[PDB]
Every structure is written in structure tokens, then in C-alpha cells.
Amino acid sequence: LEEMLTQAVQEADIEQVRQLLERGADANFQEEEWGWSPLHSAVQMDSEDLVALLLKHGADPCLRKRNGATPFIIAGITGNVRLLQLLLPNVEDVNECDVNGFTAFMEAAVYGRVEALRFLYENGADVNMHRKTKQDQERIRKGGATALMDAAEKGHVGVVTILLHAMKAEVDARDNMGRNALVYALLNPDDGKAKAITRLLLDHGADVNVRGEGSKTPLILAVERKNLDLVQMLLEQEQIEVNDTDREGKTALLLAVELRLEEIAKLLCHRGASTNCGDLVAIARRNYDSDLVKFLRLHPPAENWKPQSSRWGEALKHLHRIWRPMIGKLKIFIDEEYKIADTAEGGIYLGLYEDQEVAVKRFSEGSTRGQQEVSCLQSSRANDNVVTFYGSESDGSCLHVCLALCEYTLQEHLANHRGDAVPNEEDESARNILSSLFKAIGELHRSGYSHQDLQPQNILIDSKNGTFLADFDKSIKWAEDPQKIKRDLEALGLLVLYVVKKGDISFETLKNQSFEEVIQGSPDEETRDLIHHLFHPGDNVEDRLSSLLAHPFFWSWESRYRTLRDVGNESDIKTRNQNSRILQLLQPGTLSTSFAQWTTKIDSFVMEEMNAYNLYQDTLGDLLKFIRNLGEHINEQKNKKMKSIIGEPSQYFQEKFPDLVMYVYTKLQNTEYMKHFPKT
Amino acid sequence: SLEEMLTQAVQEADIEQVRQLLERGADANFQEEEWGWSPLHSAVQMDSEDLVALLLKHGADPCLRKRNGATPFIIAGITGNVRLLQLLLPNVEDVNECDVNGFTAFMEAAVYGRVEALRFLYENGADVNMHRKTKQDQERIRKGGATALMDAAEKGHVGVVTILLHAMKAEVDARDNMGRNALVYALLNPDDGKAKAITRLLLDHGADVNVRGEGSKTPLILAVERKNLDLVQMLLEQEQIEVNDTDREGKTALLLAVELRLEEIAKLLCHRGASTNCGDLVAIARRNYDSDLVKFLRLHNWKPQSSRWGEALKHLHRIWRPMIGKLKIFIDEEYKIADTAEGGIYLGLYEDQEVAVKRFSEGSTRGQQEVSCLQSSRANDNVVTFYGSESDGSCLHVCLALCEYTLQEHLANHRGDAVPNEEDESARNILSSLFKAIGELHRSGYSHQDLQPQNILIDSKNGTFLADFDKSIKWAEDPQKIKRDLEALGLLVLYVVKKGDISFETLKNQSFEEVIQGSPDEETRDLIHHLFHPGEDRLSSLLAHPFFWSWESRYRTLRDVGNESDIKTRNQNSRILQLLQPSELSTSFAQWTTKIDSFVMEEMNALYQDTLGDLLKFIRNLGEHINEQKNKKMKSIIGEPSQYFQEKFPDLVMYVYTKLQNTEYMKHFPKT
């Protein structure tokens, strides 16, 4: 309303800029997003009188914006030379600069403003001055460039010629990296202008063995340019070092052959390039360049690269060996030897991404499934049980998403390890796989995605038994539809049974069972109870996966036995105090379980020495008291024939009483006696 | 050895030696099994009339395929020599035979600009209008499908384009499986002159100019992005071009015309009805310093996930800046998070994701191996996640996961959450994460070389991460420097147990004996001792040290040992009792019976003396009975039993652990 009123200095309606400071407006007010003044914005705009009128009323031409720039320094851009006259007698130093080191003179140069450049020249502008930025852009070797180097790279060949001859400029000045004006010139895409500037620079003495980005020489920048005349112009100078290399060990001539440039290559041999830094007749061969193989005849490397994968090892050693073009950071070969699996689109192949072994999922460049795989992958880099995502690269027609390379599918993994477990033993491996999937899906959901198609083909296991989620091309952002989360939790129900039964029941058999059949298929009570909570997670999913990680399904056998004994040691169970708080949680009001008359179901010998004191009753309390008492003494020397008949006590009590830990868990679940549960 | 010198003789163009070793029996159809090359293949590729004619005479058939499936006939389209093409034509069933990717002889005459071969194949039935038919793993990706014309277009072969459309039936507006016609192919040739000519021929034959391609670009949008005034003019001469069509990003031809600072392209796109409201365009000429374009336009929500850096990133998303590859960054103190030796650390947006950006000089040795180490750590869950690098030619930007706090800040922010002699569970969680992270780094072949609380990061969910790998080394080259990491870790163990109260530089200035005396407990001293005196993947095994045992777990282990039969029956020749009896210095629990509260000991004797065996039996017995009502005034004087026995006998857990460490009685340690 107030100072925003002289938005009118932008409308260039000067009667509204005249009048509305007539009522009072701070011509030096600076909007502080970027610090522009009316007097700044007038010179960028180039107006005789919008400038003169603000000058007319005390607006100072040296106030700086965020960039650090003056109305003088930006007046070097517009190139208007008595806009510079109207504010020349108001400038302390004609070589004032902005925060990045730019003087009025240096910016007449980058914008080709020739009349501006000579007016500032004979009023004391330093043509040779290097740019002085802040120290955080100096400890990375920026700054130090001259006016000459930006007249160079921007192609102002008119502005360049005047600097070397009329203005004394320093041709072989370097910037803080070491580049001279020369390398700036050969980064200009304009072929004509790049040719003219470099001939002007060279004949005044630019060092032609400087280096630039990539450690390339000027000659290597000419070759990668595919430009015949710069290669010959540069070699016309007889101190050129032909066999110099970039950071990657390639000489100019090696690239000359690689990129199928016959005559470019022919002159660098004719001028002393090395015929021995690589296999150069092999490269011209595979480039179908008959005339260049022909001439290269008339005038090896041992190999370490270890793949980390064992299954894919020998296929990836081979792909390291063969020559392939790069698709970005990615080396790939569509061939059946490197094929991992078939997709609806493109399949998945092996790969080398920045020399790391990867799996490559190939999508068509437009495909919706691809864009949906990538976004979800991008929200999951913090999810430790999602396959690591290295990055995408597209060849303009086909998108390659590159992922951490794994060894086996969950289904393959369960097959290869079906025989490692004694029939009569604890399945720790099932708990590990399934707990990783709970976390993986839990984190996926907190990140706002639902997978929508989990099944053992999408679950990956790597060289060290980690399990990973993969294949997110059917995923959805679930915020717009929060009840769709429930399909991930039914699939998890199916997978809990899939893994507990060790792969014996195919996943597709399960996908055709009703919920109630799969529950009956559960082998034990912990498992049936867990699956139930995955099929009925509530209109209240929230984060039901995290709490289930505390289910007794995930308790070891030692932990289960420990909890049963620790409850059994509470004071009121040993004294059989039925009005206690613990006994009223476990057995209030009067059956129907596997441990009613539990005294009946343990063998009569073991029952008799436990009555080395009335006696034990058909109480759940007394059965926990029992477990505690035998727990503390099963190993003592008087009781070796007890120990022999019980077997391992944890297994004994669980298989004789299948529902017991689930019952105790259920009764103590949200009570102080939770403290006896194992740590989660 | 017989067929191997036939091959190098055919590459040596030694035709008298190829004569000799063919009559001596060399299989002229032998194929090397890496790529499927035959002598007759190498003969056509090499362009030699005489090697070819000689092999043909000896049964070498032009139907053998290499790995790609290409025959010497198809390779003869590449060589372009038209008298090798005569000598193998009457030996091929089908002049449009193709390799696995769909390439015919005609089609390779087009990509290699071989006009004389191109018209020889045309007058023997070569199909000019054929699209490329590949295999299903290049087929379900809508790849392929290009014509001879689309290839001659992209390659700028101005001679071959004229003959296909005029002399040879070519179809100007044929599409490939992606939908591109020859037009978009033409406007990818970098040569401005040749791209200009191909475009005028395609246009005059009826090429549809409302194709879209790669990037959802229209031909007009690639004419602007090429910055070719004369190419934009040819396309607009046709009056059904859809000017106000846009690419995948909603950016229009004129929007791009203003952004990339070219006046005359913009002036001619307004005069033909481009939309002056597809963006705010006079602000764009404003920001690009063109006064002549401001003159002419006179005539006409995103949520960050970070909390500390939230409002700074809302601002950086708002403002305009150029991209360095995938990286949006602005160097200003408002976005500075921390300072490095070189370049500092800033916020950034990488493919519109939050990152911290470490800036190095493009040549720097340190920047280079922050990255080398970062790439070997993608599997390491406790190293900061690494997104990728981007260079602007002067300065390498490595972009990493953004975290909330340094360890030192995190210990400050939670310093008051703690009761004074609380069990410090959080110290165990931080430090075990650090053990896992440094353990994983070492297995990957790197040593950090400068661990310090400023390099340890804490994210929105109390996870800890290692960062700053610019002093790191591959440790093969000097395996004795890993010791620098394990000492830093010893220092960090004390630093975290002291809750941040002792500064890291103070610890770096203490000697080893001062750091040991500064440790508050026996578990902590022993752990630091082993980090300073280790033996190759020791970090994983130390995670089983009682330092990482909770207080209940330590009390549990003592009770479980205390319940062993020979400890309760005091059989001194048993195995357990003989491990527990070394020799050793004096401990706080020799004469442990004296050091208890005198009331408590008397009800426990319903013959305790000062063996370690008996004190574990003591632990075991009081463990199982301390909570019965008969012992309520005993329970009041001990308090919590784990704390009592640890505080009366500070060395007990460590002593038992040492005695049982590599024995069967390991079974009583908590599961780690």
C-alpha cells in the first residue's frame, strides 16, 4: 500500500513515480527478499529519467542488494554509457564489486557491452582483476577469473579482441583452479566464435597445456567437440603435448578413435601421438570404420574386479569385461546371459552403476508403472528393509531404475534351506524374515505408500540373510484412500503362513483360500492369533504392525519359558492366594482349555516328586507355580530322571499345553504384570 | 590353432596366407564364441574384395549369424561397398533378412550414409518402409520401430534423406512404436546446417508436426531448446501447429523462449498466439536482464519432512534457481547448515527431495573420496544415505540424507530428560549403532579417520548415522590406521556415557590412563581398554560386552550362574567352580559377607562365606525370594537388587564375564 505503491516504477509511468514520491516514498526502501531498490530496478530497466529523477531526490546509487551489487555495477550490464556517467561521480571506486567479485567492468564483458567497456577502461578499471568471492567458495578453488575469460566463454569475440590489444589484458592469467582464457573459449558451443577467440588467444601467448574440468587439455576439448580445425590450430603451436590424458587415462587420440573421427585421429598420429595406450585397431574395428582400421595397422590389461554377489558373480565379471556404451552412470547389456527375471515391461538385468553391481528394472520411458515405482522408491531411502535404490537413467526411450543386487527370492530361499531345520526345533529364521517384513511394511506405510502386491516373488534375500522389499510399480500413495492399507496387511497374513510352513504351501493356494481356512492352516496358537490380527487390523490401522512386533509369536522359546516361570514366582501364586490381584487376572470365576486337569496330562512319575512339598491342583496358578518350581530344579543332581523324561522343559510345556503362553499373554496383556513379558 | 591363424590372417589382409590355410583345411565358417564373428563376417566389415571372393569360393555361406544375428549381407550394407553386395546377393534367400534388433542391409546403408549401396538394395527389393522388429524385452518398452528414414534423419545424412522421400517411396509420417516420426529424429542432429535441410524436406512431404517424443516435447519445443531461429520459423509456417501444447512439465515453447534468453524466438511466438499466462513471463525476462523483452510484454504448496530445516526449505522450494543436474541449491547463509575445510554444507533439493550438500572443488582429493567411501556404504544402515553427485564444472556437489542434529546437539537437547543415577539405556543405543556402523565400514574396506561427535548425525527418529568421509582411506593400504577409529570410539564411549558433559577436545587431550580413570564404572573401563588394545572384526563381537547388558540382564545372568548345581552343592572340583577361582588382584567381593547390611545376612543363612561361588548362590537365592511377604523389610533395605549388588560390588559383572567368556557357561550371558 505504502512503499509497494511505487510498484509504479516498474509500470514506467513516471507521473505516478513523480507524484507518489510527491506524497512521500522512500526511494531507498529495499524489499528484503532480494534487496532491490527503485534505483536498482531503474538501471536494470534502462531509463534516462527514472534513474535521473530518483537520483534527483537523494536515492543513493551505492546501496547494495543481496547479491552485493550496486546500481553502478549493474549499469555495466545494460551497457548504457551515460547511465554510467550519471552515477560515475557518485562512486568511490570504479572497481567496486559484488559479493562474488564482479565489477562494473567485468560485467560489461560478460554481456558484450563494448561502449560501456571502454568508458570504464580509461577511468581506471582494472582489466586484469580476478574475482574475489567469499571464503566458502574459495576453499573449493573457485574465483580468480578475469574479464577476458568471460568475454571468452560467452563468445564476445568483439569484446575479446579489444582486451588483448587496446587494453593490455593478461592472456595467460589463470583462475583459482588454473584455467586460462583458452579453456573458457573451447567450452563455447558456437563453432565459429570458438575458433576466432582461440586464434586470438593463442597468438598472444595463451598456454595451450593448461587443464580444465576432467583434467582435459585444450586438445582433448577439441576432440570431444569433434572439431577438425581447432585440433589443427592447437597443434600448429609446437609446444602442445599430444599424449596427455584426462583424469580417466585417455589420450586425445584414444578419444579420437573412440568417437569414430577419422581425420581427427590421422593428424594426431602424423604429429606424434602414441600408438600404444590401448587397443586402437580393435576400437576402429567395432566402429565399422574400415578406412581407419586400414591406416592404424600400417603404424593386454590384467584385471581385478571382484563381484560381491555369489549367484550372479560370473555373469558380472563378464559384463565388466566386455565393452559397452554408457547410459549415464549405468553399464548394461540386453542379453539372456545377464537377464535376471521377466517383467511386464523390459525385464530385469544385471548392471554396473558407477562400477557397482546392480539389478536393472527396465520400463518404457512413458510408463505409469515406472513413475510410480520411482516415486515410492524415492520416499523409502530411509527404510532399511527396502531394496537400496541407486538411481535412474533413461536412454530417451526406456527408463532404467537401478537397485541393490540380491541373491534369492523368498520362495527360492525357503527351498534352498528347507532341510536345515530339524523337524522338532524352533524356526528362528521365520521370525527374522517376518519381523523384517513387519518393519519394512510399517516404514513403507509411515512414508505414505501401500505396496498393493506382496507375494514371495517381491521379497528378496541378499548375501547375508537380510530380507528386502522390492517391486513397487503397483504402489499407491495411501493418504487419498487410507483404507487401502488393509490389503498390505492381508498379504502379510498370507505371508506369515507361507513362511511358517516353510514354503510347503504355495502362495497361490493361499491366495485362493478364505481367511478362515488359512487360519485353520496355522500350526500353533501364536501363529493363528497373529494372522487373525492381520486380517482384522481395525478401522484403526494407525500403526498396528509395530505393536504386533511384541506378539508372543515373536518370543523365543527361552523367553516364553522365562515369562511362564517369572509369573509362577509371584508371591500369590506360590501361596495359592485366590483373592490376590494376579490370581484374579488368571482364574476369576468358573475350564475348556488344554491345561484344565493339567495334573492329569503330565506323566505320573514327574508329578510325584514335584509333590516333594496341599498338593498341586488343576489351577492355572498351580501350573505356573509348577513350571517355576521345576524350572529352578530340573538340573539338580537328585532330579536327573525328571530331566530325562521332560526333555527340554520349554518344548515340553508348549507341546503338552499349546494354548498356555497365549492364554497368559492374553490375561496379563495390559496390566502391571506385563513386566514379566520379554523385552521387545 | 589351425583356425586361429586363419582369422588373424584375414585381419592381416594376408591373402596368400588365407589361400594356403584354407586348402590345408580351415573351417571358413568357424565362429568365435564371444560374439559370433566369422572370417566371412570380418571380410565384409574390413572391405576387401579379395578376401571375400576367396572365402565364398570355399563354402563360407552368407547366412551365418553373429551374436546380434547379423549376416555378412547385412554387414555389407554398413561397409557400403557395392561390389561386395553383388557377390553375396545370389546367396541370400531374403534381401530383408534382419538381425535380432531388426536391422536390414538397407537399414544399415541408411545409418552409415552409403547411398550407392542404398540404391543397389532398393532395385533388388529392399523394403524402404520397414520398421524395426525386436525381441519382447525391447518390445514391452515401446522401443524400436524406427525406419530407414528416421535413422537417416537423426544421423543428419542429408544425401540419404532426399533419395528416400523422392526417388524411393519413403513415408514421411510413418511412426515407430514410441510414436515419433522422422521429424523429431531430424531435430536431434547437432549439426545446425544439416538439421535445417532435413527438416524442410520432411515438412514438405507431409510430416505431422504435432508429434511428441522423449520428454513429451513437441517438435516446436525442441526447436526452441536448440535455440535455432530458422528451425522455429519453418515449423510455424504450417498453420495447424499447436503452439500452446506443452511437455511433461507444463512448460511451453514461449515459456522456454523467455527462460533461455532469446528475444527474436519469443517475439515471433507471441505474434502467432502463444499464451501470455502459462507462467509469469515478464518476471523471467526481468531475472534474465533483457530490457528489450520487458519492453514487449507491455502489450499483454509443498511440505518438507524436516522440523529443524522446515521453514528454510519451504523458502528454497519457493525461489527460482538454476539446476545443476538434479540439484537445486542456493549458496546463502540462510541455507548454510555447517562449514567444511572447503565449500561448506548447505541445504538443497535433489529431484525435489531434501538433502544436505557437501561442496568440494571439482579436482579435490578430499571430495573424491568422500564419494568413493559413500558408494561402498549403500548397504550400511548406520551411514548417512547417499543420493548422488552433481558437478557444475568447478565444484562437486555430493548430496546426502538430511538429518536433524549432531550427536553433541542431541545430547544437549536431552540432557535434562534424565534423573541423576538412572540406567542410561540411550547411551547403549547410540553406542551400539556406532559399533555397527564402524564395523560395517571396516568390512567394506574403509576407515573413517576422524570420528568426532560433529560427524555423528541424529535424524527425525532418534537413529544415529556416521557421516563425513573426506579423510577416509581404503585401509588395505595401511591396516594399522584402523586404530585411529577404535581410539576415537573409545573416546566416544566415554563422551556418551558422560551424557555430553565432557567436551570431546578435552578427551582427545587426555592420556589413555586419564580416560580410564574418568570412566564411571567397570564395564565402561574394560570396554575402552579393548578398543585401545584389540585383536579383525572385533567391533561385532564387543557388542556382546556386558557394557551393552541392561541392569536386569546383568542381574539375570548372575542369578542363572548362581543356580548352577555345583555352585549350590559347593562341589569344588566341578567345572564351574574351577573357572571361578583364580594370579588375580584383590576384588571388592572378597569378604563380601562383611560388606552387606548386617540385618539382611542373618535371614539368608536359614553357612555363607566369602567364595565367589557362594556370592552367586546368594544372588540366586535372594533373587527368587526377595518379593515374598516374609522378606518385606529385607526388600526395603536392598531396594532394587540389580542396582544394590552392582553398587556394592562394582567389579562383579566384569569378573564373572571374564571367567566364563570362552566356556560352556557362556550360555548364561544374555542373548546378543
Ligand SMILES: Nc1ncnc2c1ncn2[C@@H]1O[C@H](COP(=O)(O)O[C@@H]2[C@H](O)[C@@H](COP(=O)(O)O[C@@H]3[C@H](O)[C@@H](COP(=O)(O)O)O[C@H]3n3cnc4c(N)ncnc43)O[C@H]2n2cnc3c(N)ncnc32)[C@@H](O)[C@H]1O
Ligand atoms: N527489480 C527487482 N525487484 C524485485 N526482485 C527482483 C528484481 N530484479 C530481479 N529480482 C529477483 O532477484 C533474484 C536474483 O537477483 P540478482 O540478479 O540481483 O542476483 C543474481 C543471483 O541472485 C546472485 C547470485 O547468483 P548465483 O547463486 O547463481 O551465483 C553466481 C555464480 O554461482 C557465481 C559465478 O562466478 P564463478 O564461480 O563462475 O567464478 O557467482 C554468481 N554469478 C555468476 N554470474 C554472475 C553474474 N553475471 N552476475 C552476478 N553474479 C553472477 O547473483 C545474480 N546473478 C546470478 N547470475 C547472474 C548473471 N549471469 N548475470 C547477472 N546476475 C546474476 C531474481 O531471481 C529476481 O526474482
Ligand SMILES: Nc1ncnc2c1ncn2[C@@H]1O[C@H](COP(=O)(O)O[C@@H]2[C@H](O)[C@@H](COP(=O)(O)O[C@@H]3[C@H](O)[C@@H](COP(=O)(O)O)O[C@H]3n3cnc4c(N)ncnc43)O[C@H]2n2cnc3c(N)ncnc32)[C@@H](O)[C@H]1O
Ligand atoms: N571382426 C570382429 N571379430 C571379432 N570380434 C569383433 C569383430 N568386430 C567387432 N568385434 C567385437 O563385437 C563386439 C560386438 O560388436 P557387434 O557389431 O557384433 O554387435 C553390436 C552389439 O553388440 C549388438 C547389440 O548392441 P546394443 O545392445 O548397443 O543395441 C543397439 C540398439 O539399442 C538396438 C536397437 O536400436 P534402435 O532400433 O532403438 O535404433 O540395436 C543396437 N544397435 C544400434 N545401432 C545398430 C545398428 N546400426 N546395427 C545393428 N544394431 C544396432 O549389436 C551390434 N551393434 C550395436 N550397434 C551397432 C551399430 N551402430 N552398428 C553395427 N553393429 C552394432 C564388439 O564389441 C567387438 O569387441
Ligand SMILES: CCCCOC(=O)c1ccc(O)cc1
Ligand atoms: C532372485 C535374485 C533376484 C535379483 O533381483 C534383484 O536383485 C532385484 C532387485 C530389485 C527388484 O525390484 C527385483 C529384483
Ligand SMILES: CCCCOC(=O)c1ccc(O)cc1
Ligand atoms: C545437525 C544436522 C546436520 C545435518 O547435516 C547433515 O545432514 C549432514 C550430512 C552429511 C554430512 O557430511 C554433514 C552433515
